[PDB]
Structures are given as structure tokens and as C-alpha cells.
Amino acid sequence: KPEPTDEEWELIKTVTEAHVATNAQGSHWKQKRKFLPEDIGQAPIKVDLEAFSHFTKIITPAITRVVDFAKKLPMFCELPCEDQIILLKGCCMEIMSLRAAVRYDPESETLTLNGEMAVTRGQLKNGGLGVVSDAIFDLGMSLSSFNLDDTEVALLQAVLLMSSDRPGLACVERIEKYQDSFLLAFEHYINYRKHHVTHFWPKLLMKVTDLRMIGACHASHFLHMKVECPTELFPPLFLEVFE
Amino acid sequence: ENALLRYLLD
Ligand SMILES: Cc1nc(C(=O)NCC(=O)O)c(O)c2ccc(Oc3ccccc3)cc12
């Protein structure tokens, strides 16, 4: 099974470095980790407003790190501005969920958001995410066995960022060329890594789909939050990305 | 309409 070409190694260096430079708290994320108090985020009597405001206040730096990732990718930078905006709005929730899911800790059963905040399945659920909370936590639980490293995470983010099917894109064929390069590097790296899971590549492709479902859901649960909270209550960068 | 996200993309 074929391993990376020199061009693909160079590409893998680029994405991996982009990812490491923009991953909150880096190696230290378990040390800088504050567990959100347990009284914050219990089930109402719909949306717990206290946990909602904590989540509201960290979504903005998390969206910004995704933007920083895309900007460190040379292929991304050659896209016109509106394509970049479309591509970022499309993959922001996907990449943030991946980044939270690979920080699932089975001993405490928490995800770490923003390199700093450990939340439980119940807190993220009752703070507004609803069933999408279960989706991200289930993903984290199942990714533990895939033992993804920084490079595999980086490549997954690049594959999601370079999605030519988002509505409105001008350079659809250009974007699919970029995605095809990442997918090839990603597979050849997987071949080289020799994970001890059968059909790793087909299973990873299903994870990509799991993430694209989390990303497509955030519309059904953008409205689930605007049932209670006026639009003023969300930070502006969140409103832009999610509508 | 994406004033802030446009700015962040410089
Ligand atoms: C899905 C995800 N993720 C992250 C995150 O930090 N992921 C890991 C990382 O980027 O390092 C967040 O910080 C989120 C914050 C809020 C959120 O929804 C809400 C937004 C507003 C109100 C309620 C929930 C989803 C997040």
C-alpha cells in the first residue's frame, strides 16, 4: 500500500504545522483545563442560560482559531474572498467538533473546549447543543480507538475545509482539486502509519460523514437556541458563521 | 454582510 510522495510530505508538513500553531493550549491543554462547575448546565425545570453564556463566550476564540488555520494553508489563500467566507462558514462547526472530540477524556467523560474548559455530555447538551452534544461525545468515544495524531487531525480539517459542495462557491473545481490532494496525502500517510484497525481508511471516511452531519445539524439547533435567546445574546462572529 | 469574518480574513 502506497506511502506519501515528496510533494505529499511537504503538504503534510504544511497542514500539520498550521494545525499545531492554531490548536488551543497545544500540549498543555490537560493542565490548563478547568472543569466547568456541575451546577452549571443541569436540565431546565429547554436552555440553561448560565451554561449558554459560558459557551457563548468561548465560541468566538474557537471560531478564530479555525480562521487562523485556513489562513496558514497556501491553497486556501489563493481562493477569492467570497469562496473563503463560504468555505469557513461551512467547516467551522465541523472542525471545532473534531477538535473537541479528539480531546475526549474517558476517565472524566468530558471534552475540553478552547484548551481550557472541560464540560460533560449533560452540560453541553443543556447549554444549547441538544442531540448534537451526544453526536460530538459519541464521536470522541469512538475516535479514541483510532489513535489520531496531529497530522491525521490536520488532514481531516483540511479535507473538511476544502468542501466543493457548499452553496455559492465560484471555484468549485479548484476546491475539489485541493481536496483531492489532501485526501491522497491523508490515505498514503494512513498507509504509512499502519494502524492496527481493519479498514482504517473506510472507517475514517465514515467519521468524516459523522462530522459533516454535526455541521449540517447546526441550523436545526441554531433555531433551537433562538427560541429563547434574542439575537443580541449571541456574539457577532458566531452569528456570521452560523447564518 | 460578513463584516467581521471578512475583516479577520484581512
Ligand atoms: C463544538 C464547539 N467546540 C468548541 C471548542 O472549543 N472545540 C475544541 C477547540 O476548538 O479547541 C467550542 O468552544 C464551542 C463553543 C460553543 C459551542 O456551541 C454553542 C454556541 C453558543 C451557545 C451555546 C452553544 C460549540 C463549541
Numbering used by the authors:
A (entry chain A): 211 to 255, 263 to 460
B (entry chain C): 741 to 750
Quote the paper.
The thyroid hormone receptors (THRs) are nuclear hormone receptors regulated by endogenous thyroid hormones, including the inactive prohormone thyroxine (T4) and the bioactive hormone 3,3′,5-triiodothyronine (T3), which are critical for development regulation and metabolic homeostasis.
As expected, the native ligand T3 abolished or substantially diminished the transcriptional activity of four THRβ mutants associated with thyroid hormone resistance, V264D, H435L, R438H, and R438W, respectively (Wakasaki et al., 2016, Nomura et al., 1996, Sabet and Pallotta, 2011, Narumi et al., 2010). Surprisingly, the treatment of roxadustat either enhanced or retained the transcriptional activity of these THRβ mutants, all leading to higher induced transcriptional activity than those of T3. In contrast, the binding of roxadustat resulted in higher Tm values for four TRβ mutants than that of T3. Although all four mutant residues are located in the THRβ LBD, H435 is the only one that directly contacts ligands T3 or roxadustat, whereas the rest of the mutant residues are located outside the ligand-binding pocket, not in the range to form intimate contacts with the ligands, which makes us wonder how these mutants influence the ligand binding. To unravel the molecular basis for the RTH of the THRβ mutants and further their beneficial susceptibility to roxadustat, we performed structural studies on the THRβ mutants complexed with roxadustat. The structural analysis further revealed an apparent conformational change of residue H435 on helix 10 of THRβ for all four mutants, resulting in the loss of a critical hydrogen bond between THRβ and a critical hydroxy group of T3, which is also conserved for the other THR ligands identified so far, explaining the severely reduced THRβ activity by T3.
